[PDB]
Write an enzyme that holds these catalytic residues in place. Structure first.
Site, PDB file in Angstrom:
ATOM      1  CG  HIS A 125      -1.847   1.120   1.346  1.00  0.00           C
ATOM      2  ND1 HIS A 125      -3.137   1.021   0.868  1.00  0.00           N
ATOM      3  CD2 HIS A 125      -1.728   2.376   1.841  1.00  0.00           C
ATOM      4  CE1 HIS A 125      -3.768   2.165   1.063  1.00  0.00           C
ATOM      5  NE2 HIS A 125      -2.934   3.005   1.652  1.00  0.00           N
ATOM      6  CB  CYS A 183      -2.258   3.729  -3.605  1.00  0.00           C
ATOM      7  SG  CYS A 183      -3.380   2.481  -4.151  1.00  0.00           S
TER       8      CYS A 183
HETATM    9  C1  LIG Z   1      -2.616   1.155  -3.294  1.00  0.00           C
HETATM   10  O1  LIG Z   1      -2.598   1.373  -1.887  1.00  0.00           O
HETATM   11  C2  LIG Z   1      -3.326  -0.162  -3.617  1.00  0.00           C
HETATM   12  C3  LIG Z   1      -2.306  -1.205  -4.058  1.00  0.00           C
HETATM   13  C4  LIG Z   1      -2.502  -2.533  -3.368  1.00  0.00           C
HETATM   14  O2  LIG Z   1      -2.472  -3.567  -4.029  1.00  0.00           O
HETATM   15  N1  LIG Z   1      -2.694  -2.530  -2.000  1.00  0.00           N
HETATM   16  S1  LIG Z   1      -4.035  -2.041  -1.075  1.00  0.00           S
HETATM   17  C5  LIG Z   1      -3.736  -2.363   0.677  1.00  0.00           C
HETATM   18  O3  LIG Z   1      -4.154  -0.608  -1.106  1.00  0.00           O
HETATM   19  O4  LIG Z   1      -5.182  -2.818  -1.471  1.00  0.00           O
HETATM   20  N2  LIG Z   1      -4.386   0.093  -4.587  1.00  0.00           N
HETATM   21  C6  LIG Z   1      -5.657  -0.020  -4.141  1.00  0.00           C
HETATM   22  O5  LIG Z   1      -5.978  -0.515  -3.059  1.00  0.00           O
HETATM   23  C7  LIG Z   1      -6.722   0.521  -5.098  1.00  0.00           C
HETATM   24  C8  LIG Z   1      -7.268   1.874  -4.649  1.00  0.00           C
HETATM   25  C9  LIG Z   1      -8.470   1.535  -3.830  1.00  0.00           C
HETATM   26  C10 LIG Z   1      -9.045   0.262  -4.396  1.00  0.00           C
HETATM   27  N3  LIG Z   1      -7.908  -0.340  -5.117  1.00  0.00           N
HETATM   28  C11 LIG Z   1      -7.863  -1.519  -5.760  1.00  0.00           C
HETATM   29  O6  LIG Z   1      -6.854  -1.897  -6.357  1.00  0.00           O
HETATM   30  C12 LIG Z   1      -9.125  -2.379  -5.744  1.00  0.00           C
HETATM   31  N4  LIG Z   1      -9.175  -2.963  -7.066  1.00  0.00           N
HETATM   32  C13 LIG Z   1     -10.316  -3.324  -7.666  1.00  0.00           C
HETATM   33  O7  LIG Z   1     -11.399  -3.181  -7.103  1.00  0.00           O
HETATM   34  C14 LIG Z   1     -10.130  -3.890  -9.001  1.00  0.00           C
HETATM   35  C15 LIG Z   1      -8.879  -3.671  -9.670  1.00  0.00           C
HETATM   36  C16 LIG Z   1      -8.649  -4.244 -10.955  1.00  0.00           C
HETATM   37  C17 LIG Z   1      -9.685  -5.016 -11.553  1.00  0.00           C
HETATM   38  C18 LIG Z   1      -9.478  -5.575 -12.862  1.00  0.00           C
HETATM   39  C19 LIG Z   1     -10.517  -6.324 -13.516  1.00  0.00           C
HETATM   40  C20 LIG Z   1     -11.788  -6.518 -12.857  1.00  0.00           C
HETATM   41  C21 LIG Z   1     -12.032  -5.978 -11.541  1.00  0.00           C
HETATM   42  C22 LIG Z   1     -11.007  -5.233 -10.869  1.00  0.00           C
HETATM   43  C23 LIG Z   1     -11.195  -4.655  -9.578  1.00  0.00           C
HETATM   44  C24 LIG Z   1      -8.984  -3.480  -4.670  1.00  0.00           C
HETATM   45  C25 LIG Z   1     -10.003  -4.581  -4.912  1.00  0.00           C
HETATM   46  C26 LIG Z   1      -9.165  -2.884  -3.282  1.00  0.00           C
END
Ligand SMILES: *C(=O)[C@H](CC(=O)NS(C)(=O)=O)NC(=O)[C@@H]1CCCN1C(=O)[C@@H](NC(=O)c1ccc2ccccc2c1)C(C)C
EC number: 3.4.22.36
Lengths: 88, 167
Positions: free
Chosen positions: B107, B155
């Site tokens: 994160h 992120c």
């Molecule tokens: C940055 O902090 C993170 C990187 C990470 O992997 N770690 S963490 C602790 O933060 O989860 N990025 C995120 O968390 C981002 C920002 C908030 C939600 N998020 C996600 O990546 C979510 N992703 C999806 O919901 C998602 C991503 C790609 C994808 C491709 C095809 C079909 C559906 C989806 C859904 C996650 C689930 C929290």
């Protein structure tokens, strides 16, 4: 004798996104940035220097679509092309 | 393996054109390449990075296929990381290596990567400038004049980064 050497050089960072912005990850396929970099690495590692491949990864994020993100290469200080010459 | 190999013809031509503006790679039989992968999946406060295992399996295998030695580390904190990074700049194998691959997966905030103990009340981040400090020509003269590729998956904030525009 002692000689001077640049304190910082031959570096190259590749972030998953741009400042203030998030990066996307799939609970079943993991991060997207990582999967794309791999996909490209396996393909262009043989004819493109890591710098050209990173660009190609960026270009792959050129069209937004809900889960948009633009990777950025920072603090690049590479003085020459860096070929991986896979198989060698 | 999965990595498309480079034929001797191409390997020769590429080097035939760029020769002086390309990094010299050590001999395939003597060089000892090292790669470090630090990825935090579970956190004390922030939601677990579910699906990180698939990335660890991805990178490790890829880097190892590029002829690197992958040492995987998990769920570390700002300190634990800044300690794990120093022990890496020290590795003797660098001396007989032509480069190195660093890989951070966790994160993150605008400021930097988030250790497993990060929280709003008590921060636990690793500034990017620090990572560049632990491996410069001053704290790791073994990697001097050798490409050091740093990959980070985190992120960089909260904003979606997308802006509306009509066509
Ligand atoms: C940055 O902090 C993170 C990187 C990470 O992997 N770690 S963490 C602790 O933060 O989860 N990025 C995120 O968390 C981002 C920002 C908030 C939600 N998020 C996600 O990546 C979510 N992703 C999806 O919901 C998602 C991503 C790609 C994808 C491709 C095809 C079909 C559906 C989806 C859904 C996650 C689930 C929290």
């Amino acid at each position: 004798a002692i000689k001077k050497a640049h304190i910082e050089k031959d570096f190259i960072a590749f972030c998953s996104s741009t400042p203030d912005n998030v990066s996307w990850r799939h609970p079943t396929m993991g991060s997207v940035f990582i999967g794309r970099l791999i996909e490209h690495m396996q393909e262009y590692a043989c004819s493109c220097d890591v710098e050209e491949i990173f660009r190609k990864v960026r270009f792959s994020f050129e069209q937004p679509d809900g889960r948009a993100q633009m990777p950025t290469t920072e603090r690049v200080t590479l003085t020459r092309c860096f070929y991986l010459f896979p198989g060698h | 393996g999965n990595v498309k190999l480079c034929s001797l013809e191409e390997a020769q031509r590429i080097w035939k054109q760029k020769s002086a503006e390309i990094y010299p790679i050590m001999d395939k039989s003597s060089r000892t390449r090292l790669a470090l992968i630090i990825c935090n999946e579970e956190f004390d406060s922030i939601p677990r990075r579910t699906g990180a295992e698939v990335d660890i399996t991805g990178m490790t295998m890829l880097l190892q296929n590029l002829g690197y030695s992958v040492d995987v580390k998990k769920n570390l904190t700002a300190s634990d990381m800044t300690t794990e990074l120093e022990a890496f700049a020290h590795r003797p194998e660098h001396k007989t290596s032509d480069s190195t691959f660093l890989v951070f997966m966790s994160h993150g905030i605008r400021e930097g990567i988030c250790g497993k103990k990060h929280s709003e009340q008590v921060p636990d981040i690793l500034q990017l400038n620090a990572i560049f400090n632990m491996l410069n020509t001053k704290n790791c003269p073994s990697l001097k004049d050798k490409p050091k590729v740093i990959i980070i998956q985190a992120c960089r904030g909260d904003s979606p980064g997308v802006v509306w525009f009509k066509d």
